[PDB]
């Protein structure tokens, strides 16, 4: 089953720059105290980058849970900034339906789930939270030909619906190249309530997954909330996505 | 299809007395596969199926009998090894001038123990000659300073 939203506004997509932020390992070759060259993509320095929000404002019964199928270009950047981990993971593929292979990546609450099969995707893929802790998955309805999984070993998120402004600022690089899809992540702690805070960032490589599938789209698996296991309710997260471009 | 950085080996070999039935493969795309993409969609839109069939027997003529393929793809990162032939070890030969050969990094120099830090993956050391000025011992995982001979 697939939970449902009603009354969406749409995404805003106000921007915001990536101030050198989002450099990654270019490529596997170890190197030490050298200064190295290279053309490849990346995110330029300053670029522009749009801002997708998960929000709640009963006042104006505005909901936004901006979680749209956006294209995946060279690559992407992809930053979170959070406070109650709204933002548990991506969907990538083509069609985002069950016509295609599609990988997901998530925090499953207990685990990171990474999965290529015939996804048939809710229209709202989402986790729930009930009564600060995890509710059920409503990611997918049928996962048919499944031909890759992965699964990290066990922990627990923090889920419930911390007040205040965000604290946590987590950073992503996605390539698909040579049929790896290549993560790459940085954390840095935040205290701020607005946009990307400026900042150099260098972004470790988390995964190099053998995913031969094609991907040309994307987009972000968030949680609502409830005390009541009904009325699920948004909750203030925001993601940036910036596109990788060819650059030296 | 295969990257044109591609490092490994192509391996094939005719089985066309075990492989016989009916296998698929795709006739006609709108566009090229990337390199190691994989395309597993059945039905176009309307229904009909894209993917065209080999007829697969031991009385088809050779070319049309079946192989099959393994494609094995490397990688020689300075990481730990994770598959190696068959070798044998020998003893560590420091302070002469020997050849040696540490993961099947081949060379020649002189060893010696090292003050070297390295990270907890690494497994040599150059300089900014490329030089490989030391090695992770695979059997110790002490780190060995090479010299020139
Ligand atoms: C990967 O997937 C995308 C999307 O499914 C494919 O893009 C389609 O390509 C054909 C021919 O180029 C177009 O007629 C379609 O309109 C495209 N669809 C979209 C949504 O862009 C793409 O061809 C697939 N293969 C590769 C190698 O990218
Ligand atoms: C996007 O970039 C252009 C120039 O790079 C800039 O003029 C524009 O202001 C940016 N977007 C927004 C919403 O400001
Ligand atoms: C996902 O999390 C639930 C509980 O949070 C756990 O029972 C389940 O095992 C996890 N998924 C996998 C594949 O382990
Ligand atoms: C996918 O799964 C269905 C059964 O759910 C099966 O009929 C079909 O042949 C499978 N296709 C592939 C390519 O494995
Ligand atoms: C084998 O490798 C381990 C770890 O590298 C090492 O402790 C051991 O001495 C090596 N040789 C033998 C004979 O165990």
């Given at each position: 089953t697939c939970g449902t939203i009603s009354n969406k506004t749409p995404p805003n997509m106000n921007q915001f720059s990536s101030s050198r932020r989002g450099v990654y390992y270019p490529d596997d070759i170890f190197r030490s105290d050298v200064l190295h060259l290279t053309q490849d993509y990346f995110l330029p320095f300053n670029?522009?980058?749009?801002?997708?929000?998960?929000?709640?404002?009963?006042s104006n019964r505005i909901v936004r849970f901006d979680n749209?199928?956006?294209?995946?270009?060279?690559?992407?950047?992809?930053?979170?900034?959070?406070?109650?981990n709204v933002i548990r993971g991506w969907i990538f593929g083509s069609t985002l339906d069950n016509t295609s292979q599609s990988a997901i990546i998530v925090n499953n609450s207990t685990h990171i789930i990474i999965?290529?099969?015939?996804?048939?995707?809710?229209?709202?893929?989402?986790?729930?939270?009930?009564?600060?802790?995890?509710?059920?998955?409503?990611v997918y309805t049928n996962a048919r030909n499944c031909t890759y999984e992965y699964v990290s070993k066990s922990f627990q998120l923090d889920v419930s619906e911390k007040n205040g402004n965000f604290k946590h600022l987590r950073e992503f690089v996605f390539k698909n190249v040579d049929g790896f899809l290549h993560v790459y992540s940085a954390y840095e702690p935040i205290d701020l309530?607005?946009?990307?805070?400026?900042?150099?960032?260098?972004?470790?490589?988390?995964?190099?997954?053998?995913?031969?599938?094609?991907?040309?789209?994307?987009?972000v698996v968030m949680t609502m909330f409830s005390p009541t296991t009904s009325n699920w309710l948004a909750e203030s997260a925001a993601y940036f996505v910036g596109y990788l471009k060819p650059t030296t | 299809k295969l990257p044109d950085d591609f490092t490994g080996c192509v391996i094939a070999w005719n089985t066309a007395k075990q492989d016989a039935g009916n296998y698929y493969?795709?006739?006609?795309?709108?566009?090229?596969?990337?390199?190691?993409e994989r395309d597993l969609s059945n039905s176009d839109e309307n229904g009909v199926r894209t993917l065209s069939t080999y007829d697969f027997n031991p009385n088809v003529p050779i070319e049309y009998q079946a192989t099959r393929v393994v494609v094995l793809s490397f990688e020689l990162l300075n990481a730990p090894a994770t598959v190696c032939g068959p070798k044998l070890s020998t003893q560590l030969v420091k302070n002469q001038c020997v050849n040696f050969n540490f993961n099947g990094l081949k060379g020649?120099?002189?060893?010696?123990?090292?003050?070297?830090?390295?990270?907890?993956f690494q497994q040599f050391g150059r300089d900014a000659s490329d030089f490989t000025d030391s090695?992770?011992?695979?059997?110790?995982?002490?780190?060995?300073?090479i010299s020139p001979c």
């Open positions: 670029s522009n980058v749009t801002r997708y929000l998960s929000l709640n404002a009963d749209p199928i956006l294209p995946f270009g060279d690559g992407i950047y992809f930053a979170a900034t959070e406070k109650s999965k290529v099969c015939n996804f048939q995707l809710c229209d709202d893929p989402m986790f729930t939270v009930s009564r600060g802790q995890h509710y059920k998955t409503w309530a607005r946009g990307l805070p400026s900042g150099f960032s260098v972004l470790k490589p988390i995964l190099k997954l053998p995913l031969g599938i094609n991907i040309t789209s994307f987009r | 493969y795709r006739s006609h795309r709108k566009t090229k596969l990337k390199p190691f020649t120099g002189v060893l010696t123990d090292s003050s070297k830090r390295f990270q907890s090695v992770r011992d695979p059997q110790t995982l002490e780190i060995l300073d």
